[PDB]
Design a binder for this molecule. Structure first.
Ligand code: HEM
Length: 137
């Protein structure tokens, strides 16, 4: 289930983090508008841009902590506050986060692996709700 999925992703977190974030950017090309430097790049090129590899690994390092600190796929309000408050996310709305989790769930659904994709779907919705409550637009 969800807690085992955290251990699976953490066991190869660099590859999962890149493959899910690329799934997100290819499913929602307009989302590259928050990045700029990513435009007109193939997946293999993106993987070779330092701010892609670094920022994608740090997204997934923190997302796995937030998942790990969750009860029944409900994140801590403190984790939502922390995320909202991040100066680098000034641009963002809950819409950016919803789309990332739609792509994550779709990626898990298409994998050959026994991920608990319905738990991730609820995690993504609960995190979007928590971010809104914590002040994200
Ligand atoms: C659980 C989800 C996410 C987490 C944990 C997260 C985490 C982070 C972290 C830790 C940083 C700082 C890392 C660093 O720059 O060294 C960062 C920067 C940034 N995040 Fe996020 N982020 C998340 C989702 C998103 C989403 C959905 C977007 C846009 C759709 C986004 C856009 C950005 C941007 C634009 C930056 C800085 C600009 C750059 O990449 O050069 N983040 N994020």
């Amino acid at each position: 289930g969800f807690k085992q999925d955290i251990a699976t992703l953490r066991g190869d977190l660099r590859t999962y983090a890149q493959d899910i974030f690329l799934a997100f950017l290819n499913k929602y090309p307009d989302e590259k508008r928050n990045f700029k430097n990513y435009v007109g790049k193939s997946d293999q090129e993106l993987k070779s841009m330092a701010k892609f590899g670094d920022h994608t690994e740090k997204v997934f390092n923190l997302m796995m902590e937030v998942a790990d600190r969750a009860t029944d796929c409900v994140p801590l309000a403190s984790d939502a506050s922390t995320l909202v408050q991040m100066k680098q996310h000034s641009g963002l709305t809950t819409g950016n986060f919803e789309k990332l989790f739609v792509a994550l769930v779709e990626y898990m659904r298409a994998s050959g692996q026994s991920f608990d994709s319905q738990s991730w779907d609820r995690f993504g919705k609960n995190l979007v709700s928590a971010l809104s409550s914590a002040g994200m637009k």
